[PDB]
Ligand binder design. Structure first.
Ligand SMILES: NC(=O)c1ccc[n+]([C@@H]2O[C@H](COP(=O)([O-])OP(=O)(O)OC[C@H]3O[C@@H](n4cnc5c(N)ncnc54)[C@H](O)[C@@H]3O)[C@@H](O)[C@H]2O)c1
Ligand SMILES: NC(=O)c1ccc[n+]([C@@H]2O[C@H](COP(=O)([O-])OP(=O)(O)OC[C@H]3O[C@@H](n4cnc5c(N)ncnc54)[C@H](O)[C@@H]3O)[C@@H](O)[C@H]2O)c1
Ligand SMILES: NC(=O)c1ccc[n+]([C@@H]2O[C@H](COP(=O)([O-])OP(=O)(O)OC[C@H]3O[C@@H](n4cnc5c(N)ncnc54)[C@H](O)[C@@H]3O)[C@@H](O)[C@H]2O)c1
Ligand SMILES: NC(=O)c1ccc[n+]([C@@H]2O[C@H](COP(=O)([O-])OP(=O)(O)OC[C@H]3O[C@@H](n4cnc5c(N)ncnc54)[C@H](O)[C@@H]3O)[C@@H](O)[C@H]2O)c1
Ligand SMILES: Oc1ccc(-c2ccc(O)cc2)cc1
Ligand SMILES: Oc1ccc(-c2ccc(O)cc2)cc1
Lengths: 275, 268, 275, 268
């Protein structure tokens, strides 16, 4: 177990990637505080991991809620080693042309409050614990932080904003707190969109994400959620990532290195090389 | 004159770089519409340029104001060839640790609404005109869209967000509208910050910041925008990001420039 | 005319993009020294531009030849304002698996000597003139300097190497000489490959470059050579590019911002927006 | 132990980071083959690890030597799961102006042959084994693959060239072999330079260089490579570039770190 004795706070950890990370982190011997708006899912996760996980109901948009999360983590586990600001919503790749004039202001505020302000508030709230533990922050970005067509303008802009948070916060929190980014690409989660665009009851598992990506990913297949948790384990292992700050790990199946006419260049290698 | 007959719409054009841009674009034979909140400075640019500039008083955060600018530019000039969303506000380089808890949510909204939303609204308002003209968008970014310590988390995130608008809108508006970013940096102008808030002068730290070893006048940053506005010269460019900041991203560890002693080394 | 009184030295200016740049620069009122191995093409270009262009026969791999070029430019025109190191050869996207063991060492040396060493030698040779004129260097890179599948390992590695030259030289030559990169994407030129791979008598005009790129470029069409000369004009205009050093202009039709399932996202905008 | 049963081939593994990597990989339950020119240090690592390491004396510039390493690793261990091309030489940060005209062509060949060609040959030699194992390549890059002043033009260009090998080989070897780069930086080891050639200690300039404010031991850079070698943890990653350099790319203008006074600010 790589993370014995470590304590993480994960925002958005009641489902999706956040939950997989909760499960993974605990299995690696970490204790985990989760901040999330789903009270139901938070309790299921507490009973799933008796004594190694504590859920706090709150909204990542509220600094006070974030502070409560940090307080609760401190109260239960005595420190915070790794903050993983992870809660997010999608825009379902709604193009600028397709954003209605009378909804765009509301949609902007929703997606940016959650995706960017929620990350700032998480760090703000945990800053005393992180300086104390000489800890780290690992932000969940996305391939939409680097390339287009992973989201419309709003989502792509929020995830690029998060890259800026990686950079600025690695600077500001240095030398005491390390700040890095994992940018995963394509995950069968329960990811929602803004109620403003009528997408708040729409989950990404309901989209054929895996099949759209089949001929877009050089690796050929969209990885399972468990397969995305390793990068975070890595950044959360103190002895393994000490030199890392300002690091951005593109963790998306090769989206930035796909070819022009096909995703991959080496379909024929096995036969070409005779086994 | 390289922009004869072209029409530009510039947000934040009543002062600073935006005003340098208006002036340069007018001198290149373009006709310019300007959306800015400052009535006095809009009038001031209007008298400067006669009928070659039109000012519209409004707020970049307002999609309606952005539509009025668009409509005004079309009424005045018949088309919009190049849109320069440029208005932005700074955060004074206020560190996260230094953002007061009772100020932070308001600061966030103010700087994102102006710096990111006002860019989104400009494009949205101008989209019919830009597609009709097979036009261009050129976003004013900043060094803070690429490296830290050019503002606080709020400003740095806003400018990274506009890099994201470059990339996404280049994709979405292709093949008809070209979308690119200029990332200015060596500057020295009163970039205002939010009412909810309130650093070392650039001159005081120049050799730690700019390999070019000097502080360009505002006039010297308008060329990149003219280039992107010039259809004959920038046709291949979409999704491009022009770091325009005196070499901030390629500065040395001990001093910005690596070649102070080249003249002595080469005897000249 | 934007470049009246300016003097440029362009390596590889006897054909392709280099020649278009020679033509463009002269039409903008510049004087141009060209270093190139084709004596024939260099004379055609001298007579094309009587008094505004001077050709020097030489090999970009030879520092001494490069120095002669610089000497000749000085002798004819009195200064050097802008160096454009531009000469290059392709590898025809020959995959690592397809590089024969007994040719790879030779192919490496050929492509790297021309593409990287030729650029270093150009700058070295012109360095006294450039410091004297407070001039600039503008390197011809390629989309292969940023993304794969624009060349095999060799070519892609040489063009990434050139990005490193932009950065390191902008640093080293600061504050007296500015150093920037233009990275064009897809040009109907006479571009050759290494004799080692049997491609030295193979030109890129012989490849259906334009048609392969039709559904890869967000802009929809591969631009003509003339349409790529503007970026260089821009960097060569002193009053327009003074703040620029370390700049990399991706100038390739949108290759880095193409979508997953299609190159462009806005085919339908005209009808969608009602004109 | 996270690498139980896996086989690594590491070039440049008899000393520095490469030797740290060998040791770490062996401690994680991997078996390692090493290509290095230094016979003495290969023997030294061989006695250190018993049959868990095999050394092959050879030159990374030689494709035949790289094939012999590959062949030796297969004979010893039956497969190759992860290839770490790591051998590289420095240029002492010799500026272009300072490269002697009678030395420059030879220096160029020496540093490119080792730093770029030896990486190409490693992959070429190991390609059948890596495709057979659905394996990984992890190139040692450097901060000089991303920012200036980490070496001269020759070293900086070589390391930028390996970023290009990351991208191209990730494309070419997909979907079977994953290709990624680690870009180490905070280090302090005798990185040798060419015979044709011949700067400030890192310690002397640390606060201008590393936001992490310390100089990690070599042991502290092996984790990233273990990660990429761990099939259960890094399956999504191809074409990835991990800046592993103490924050060199996110350093401040006046000082590397922006938060020296956070403990006082937050009272702890
Ligand atoms: N799913 C994908 O395809 C994908 C790809 C790349 C990156 N991401 C990013 O991964 C991260 C995790 O999302 P996911 O895909 O696992 O979706 P998800 O909905 O399954 O998980 C998101 C979690 O965030 C919580 N949450 C949302 N808003 C909140 C708020 N205001 N306050 C408190 N909790 C809130 C939700 O309750 C949920 O438990 C997000 O940042 C998302 O942008 C997703
Ligand atoms: N000045 C620098 O140091 C620097 C460096 C890099 C990038 N930038 C960027 O340059 C761009 C403009 O800078 P500048 O030099 O013109 O700055 P400036 O502050 O001098 O001018 C900004 C203009 O925007 C207008 N404006 C501000 N808020 C507005 C609103 N809500 N609605 C309408 N108009 C509004 C102001 O009236 C003013 O005319 C901004 O995007 C800025 O972030 C500045
Ligand atoms: N053509 C494309 O698709 C494309 C795309 C992006 C970038 N580029 C780059 O554009 C630059 C110009 O090449 P081009 O496509 O116009 O090809 P080209 O062959 O038409 O032009 C190249 C010129 O370089 C000269 N040259 C080659 N080796 C030389 C040497 N050793 N010494 C002196 N002169 C030499 C040739 O004689 C020729 O005149 C190169 O750096 C190339 O890598 C080409
Ligand atoms: N040390 C630093 O300051 C630093 C920083 C960033 C990146 N790097 C990179 O780290 C990697 C290795 O560095 P290190 O710390 O191991 O350096 P090192 O010089 O201590 O070790 C290099 C190893 O490569 C071997 N080697 C050199 N040339 C060879 C050849 N032609 N054939 C076979 N073997 C050869 C040497 O024998 C030695 O074992 C290199 O790619 C280097 O450029 C180093
Ligand atoms: O955060 C996200 C959400 C959706 C995608 C996505 C990528 C490709 C695709 O075809 C559909 C969705 C990527 C990142
Ligand atoms: O320098 C070069 C050479 C060839 C391409 C190229 C790009 C796409 C393609 O389909 C074929 C060739 C790009 C840059």
């Amino acid at each position: 177990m790589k993370l014995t004795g470590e304590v993480a706070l994960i925002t958005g950890g009641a489902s999706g990637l956040g939950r997989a990370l909760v499960d993974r982190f605990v299995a690696e011997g970490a204790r985990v505080a989760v901040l999330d708006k789903s009270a139901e899912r938070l309790r299921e996760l507490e009973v799933a991991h008796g004594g190694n996980a504590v859920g706090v109901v709150g909204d990542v948009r509220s600094l006070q809620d974030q502070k409560r999360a940090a307080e609760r983590c401190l109260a239960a586990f005595g420190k915070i080693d790794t903050l993983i600001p992870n809660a997010g919503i999608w825009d379902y790749s709604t193009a600028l042309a397709d954003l209605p004039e009378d909804k765009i202001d509301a949609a902007f505020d929703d997606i940016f409050h959650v995706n960017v302000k929620g990350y700032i508030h998480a760090v703000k709230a945990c800053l005393p614990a992180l300086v104390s533990s000489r800890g780290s922050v690992v932000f969940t970005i996305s391939n939409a932080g680097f390339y287009p067509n992973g989201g419309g303008p709003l989502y792509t802009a929020t995830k690029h904003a998060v890259v800026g948070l990686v950079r600025q916060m690695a600077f500001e929190l240095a030398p005491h707190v390390r700040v890095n980014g994992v940018a995963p690409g394509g995950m069968n989660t329960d990811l929602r969109g803004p109620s403003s665009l009528g997408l708040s009851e729409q989950s990404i598992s309901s989209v054929p994400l895996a099949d759209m990506l089949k001929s877009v990913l050089p690796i050929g297949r969209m990885p399972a959620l468990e397969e995305y948790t390793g990068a975070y384990v890595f950044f959360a292992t103190r002895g393994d990532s000490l030199p890392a700050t300002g690091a951005l790990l593109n963790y998306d199946g090769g989206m930035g290195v796909r070819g022009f006419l096909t995703a991959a260049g080496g379909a024929d290698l096995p036969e070409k090389l005779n086994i």
